[PDB]
Design a protein around this ligand. Structure first.
Ligand code: NI
Ligand code: NI
Lengths: 440, 447, 447, 440
């Protein structure tokens, strides 16, 4: 595939999440997370897969960073594990900070920028024992955990990310139950969504006083919605799913509040939002430096479901079942800019899952090479239209634990043989590296 | 003496009036009683018992007034249609009321003066107020009925339509504070009337898109730029509450963003849940318009006050002010247009009202109202700077064309650029009218 | 200590209450908001912000209150049905509201207490006031709708019906002076509301004559006897003006006659022509009734005053009660005489009579001997009206227990049973026992 | 059936529970409970039944007490609704105490002894938002809520019951998920069981200094277990089921700690109990004044290779709950409980059956319920004839009510309730029990 051209400002990188790659779940005082409890609960993860070992990134980070530098990747988005820092109540763990200190010093010698997510769904179980995100105090514990990372690790970090996909943590974790902690109460799920948004604002406030001289933001994931027909009832359900997946978190960040027509819809099946206190939407909407965009696929939604009356039609698609629709990314970037305007935008997560197979010591994943190129072209058209797209982070650097589906989905440009823990750079990874060098 | 302000090519100047404020002839040709006829004739409600019984008698002198606007060379003219003249009783079309506005529009067409017609300028028919008025959701449908009739029988002579004029006053001054008609004092009824007013606007725009009228339609909202009296955190918060009350409550719903949520939850704490907002009402109110009319007059320096149990605000005294006690602060106009642009974007904007009230006394047969010259010149200056910044300002309507009934203050406030001596009904063009007329010609003859 | 009064055998004693003033529990079982819920929660409208939120909690303690009537031996009991409990919203029949009054009536049935049920004691649903309330003629139709449902669902446990209670206040105090719900101040609207209230009474009687209810139906009016302050020809004229305002405006239309013509044409001079009296409305209002309820408390010595622009009246102050009301028992006799001269031999009932006194319980006992003298005096005056051949058939003491005295809140104690609102405890005053002994004396007299 | 004879000390009564009987959930400040959240969650309670109205005891309590005194019932066991007292965090609601102060004086006027349960599962949702019984703080809020009841209502209460069936609250509410709050985490369930036990000990300590004159205890439910056959693996499974149902709470209350051989099986399936702090079991074992036995049926258990404990229950002689009517199993139960508690006074606080009661021509003849009551009453007499400290028998229930996850489909009461009329029709079992009381 042809290489795609971008301005000099443009920034490339890969993305990982702590619990999906790190492993070493008992090492150096790490406390139990909600995903340790969930994956070890029978019937919750595909084939009972665990994050016990994962990619052993806790021990093989030096090689993985060296693999990044050898390919010349300019940046790296990873996450800091809250349980490694605060294993139990009010107990800082210096072995947790010292690990992430040695990881950042490895990124600096390789001359690799670091975007670090503070919360990527691995909430400590002791906080879950205290109600977790249904409890408003959790939003205040995250601010203190955010403030410590600012002081102890700030110098070696370029950009901070407070939350990754609050839609999943709130609704998949407390509404549908397919994610940790696995609750199925929709009042609790929308209550968690407000406290997550509230916890984001408190961390942005603490960051402005944190003396850290870098950028701060938040990554939201979007699933573009296209009505199944020109019908009024299908165009109606498509607008409901758009507010659910794409508007519920972005607009409060943008200082607009919750989507009002959709909120009165939610309160109708639940009740009045007694968890929205006076001043929360102002704290939630404290100005950030950038917005992280996580796109993967679009949805086609027809009318139907006692909650929102929605039904998505199955998908040319990913092993996740996700249809590969590249311009839906351009349509998404265009709509986001209508709400965000000139604020810098990074694609913090984009990729696909294909049935990767290693033959003759080579992974010939032609499908991902085409996927990366299609969305890179789609990302390029948004740059030509004047959109403030600053970077594109590839998901993922290496195959890892894809949550409820276990290790059955290999999103990585580097093949990981989980029995030998050997990193084998796929053909899609070398193509990305050529895209890096071609840009610079 | 002031220098004239240059504007882009298709900038549209004009003057604005209101039906009940100028027309008079409240009993002629079967006109029904309006809420302002009932309000002004109720003792203690209007300054010295003044009413709009006669006003400027524009119902009889409209040809002289139109020809005076042609002589002065005014390209546009904003006026309102009196709902009682068209539907004097429940479901009764009045042809004589429609015929008058038909005669007026023919005079404007011959004079080559563009027409911007306001469908509701506060004169609700009393028979609708007898049925609950704006507190009743049925009023929004009767407005969509009367709005749809005007599109068909009068749309050909009309360039642009304006659904509502200053919904903030009709809702909160007529149902909350009670200083305007109908004079109610119930804040739940006020915010309920405000929603039904917004609902009637969306219904009227929906009716306009199916009306076969090919001109523009919009809404006129009045704003009051707020400035915190101090950098104090309690004064900054109050100024935010005042900003949401006056400027955000009606614009943001029309702009498809819903009510300001933080301020609405405070309103609900003082009153209760908003049981009058139904599903789909927000989308209806947010029906796309072609332009937004902007009414600006002054600012307000807001300081917090726990004495006010509703919103906790206090407005400081304006020296350098008008006869309404309104501070003359032209920079606030520029800063308001910039914020409206940040909300509306590239939506075309019109200043459908701007002016001042000054103690005008005709000496030697003409009014040397130098102080109004400086008001119009300073704000057109601030208006032009909003254009040079890239703002989509498309016109400017001076309020008013002639002195008229200034609502609760009666005839003791002279906003016009033409003096009206109500004893003889003689119109005397003031110095403001001459300067404003020269500003048109200078804009007309620029290369 | 007073001697008991003798009355004919068929004479019926009882006590009277009203829904909103005693029931409380205004959010429970789907009850809709009434105009008095909205009025009392509006600041400055009721003394010290008192509301009927809790009141006597009769909604929960009705069995204990009925049993207390049984213990004291009260033969009859007058109460009103809260319209919001039956129709909380437009076209929404609430079975829980009908179920409560079903439970209360069966409790009165077991205690052998005849029931007089008032259909409208001022607590109009706010959803009806949102549509104009009594200023809208549609309200009269909805009242005949709600009255017709009470006839069929509850008529079996109801001995007599009372359509309206004191329409003079609901119309003039609610829409003219504004001291009562809905708190409007428009005298055109007040007299318009008074006609629709009279019209709603006629429609409810027509519905009753076809309702299959085998009991009586009537209407309750409040009268204030007026005596001229002097012999001056203007004080005589002013007392005539007040007499027509308070006593004649509703009784005479009900009694087959029309509105008092001389006073009406003065009202029309102050306002305008009565365009709300359609032909046939008088015939509807004058639908024959079975009895007339009489509410009487005081007189009023009236002197002419030029400062009153409306009617030109001045009431002098008054030996009187905590309401500031003179205790003039002979005025009751003169009132019943005048009503008889108008209504003839139509059966008469005193549906309300009592006084407010500063009852303070000492040693667990309220020695309110002043209320003893009040009831005994007026019962004597009522006995004279019987001795003259007057068709007075009953006497209802207002009230059974201390309750929400409307705008004056809980600062006026009219009941014969003291209510401690902190514990909701009921303590029968000395007035309750004397009045109870008056029952047995009438029940035990051999004839 | 002939009336059963008992000593003069013996004390009869009927039992109810707040959420099952009261209704009026929104009235006078009652906060949301975990059973309001659970009932209004779809697919959790049979046919979406709720305790919204229930028996409307909040309004008919005078009628019900008068009906009890008409039948001459010596005692009444009910529960105080925690949400009525503390609707939200740190907010005493005197209206909640006002309802229960009127009910007690109604019983005192009728000369009826009152046994009051402080917790009958209706945990306030604001406490559940803080993690509920998985959070140790809940055990300390319960001690405060218990200490308040002692000072404000102590005079009108003869005996207190701290908890009712902690086995169901812990394991059905947090392990199986069929009861509120509906979690399915087995570590959370045993963690909740310890905090429920811990909350009982704190409430007993608070009572010993409460200045209340009466007695305090705990109500524990038991299901006697007999192995399916003589088989050694059925012998083992019946012992595991025995410790799970009957030993996990009674023995810690008796100062014996958790059943060790069963606990190490539990730690095998989960992990070491990190929630048992030193000194807990000492507080747990605070000496009580009586023990409340809740018996309904036995269980027949055979081995089953169940990944948790390896148990399988088997079941012509069953009620509408599907429970075998085994009167002799009650005697076997009381003998074993006496072997553990010695001469501690024992009250049967709940005992009854659910039969398909049907009213024909204004009266119900539940002759199966008279047989059930008289069967266990004879089994109760055999225990005291052997020297057992059985001092009271409480029938469940006084009237039909909301039977939790089954809604109103099970009528346990001796007074029929037609939930559309709310009329109380005394059952022919209530006929017999009122005469059995009069005979003794
Ligand atoms: Ni004329
Ligand atoms: Ni109640």
């Amino acid at each position: 595939r042809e290489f795609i051209s971008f301005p000099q400002d443009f920034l490339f990188g890969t993305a990982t999440a702590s619990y999906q790659i790190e492993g070493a779940v008992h090492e150096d005082g790490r406390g139990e997370s909600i995903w340790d409890r969930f994956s070890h609960t029978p019937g919750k993860v595909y084939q009972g897969h665990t994050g016990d070992v994962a990619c052993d990134h806790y021990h093989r980070y030096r090689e993985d960073v060296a693999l990044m530098k050898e390919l010349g990747i300019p940046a790296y988005r990873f996450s800091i594990a809250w349980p490694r820092i605060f294993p139990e109540k009010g107990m800082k763990n210096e072995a947790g900070l010292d690990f992430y200190r040695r990881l950042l010093e490895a990124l600096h010698e390789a001359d690799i920028r670091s975007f670090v997510t503070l919360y990527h769904w691995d909430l400590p179980q002791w906080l879950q024992d205290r109600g977790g995100w249904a409890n408003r105090d959790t939003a205040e514990y995250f601010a203190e955990y955010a403030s410590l990372i600012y002081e102890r690790l700030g110098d070696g970090i370029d950009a901070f990310i407070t939350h990754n996909e609050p839609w999943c943590a709130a609704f998949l974790g407390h509404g549908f139950g397919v994610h940790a902690p696995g609750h199925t109460d929709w009042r609790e799920a929308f209550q968690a969504a407000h406290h997550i948004l509230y916890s984001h604002g408190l961390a942005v406030q603490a960051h402005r006083a944190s003396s850290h001289k870098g950028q701060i933001g938040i990554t939201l994931n979007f699933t573009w919605v296209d009505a199944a027909t020109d019908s009024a009832t299908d165009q109606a359900a498509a607008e409901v799913s758009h507010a659910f997946n794409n508007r519920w978190f972005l607009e409060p960040v943008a200082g607009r509040g919750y989507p009002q027509e959709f909120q009165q819809l939610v309160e109708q099946r639940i009740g009045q939002f007694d968890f929205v206190r006076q001043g929360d939407l102002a704290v939630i909407a404290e100005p950030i430096d950038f917005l992280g965009i996580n796109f993967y696929t679009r949805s086609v939604v027809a009318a139907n479901d006692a909650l929102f009356g929605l039904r998505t039609l199955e998908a040319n698609r990913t092993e996740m079942g996700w249809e590969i629709h590249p311009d839906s990314l351009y349509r998404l970037l265009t709509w986001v800019q209508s709400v965000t305007g000139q604020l810098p935008l990074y694609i913090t997560e984009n990729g696909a899952a294909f049935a990767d197979e290693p033959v003759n010591g080579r992974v010939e994943d032609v499908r991902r090479i085409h996927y990366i190129a299609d969305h890179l072209e789609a990302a390029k058209r948004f740059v030509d239209a004047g959109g403030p797209l600053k970077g594109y982070f590839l998901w993922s650097f290496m195959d890892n634990f894809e949550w409820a589906l276990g290790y059955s989905k290999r999103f990585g440009m580097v093949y990981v043989d989980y029995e030998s823990q050997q990193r084998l750079v796929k053909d899609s990874g070398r193509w990305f590296s050529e895209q890096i060098a071609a840009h610079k």
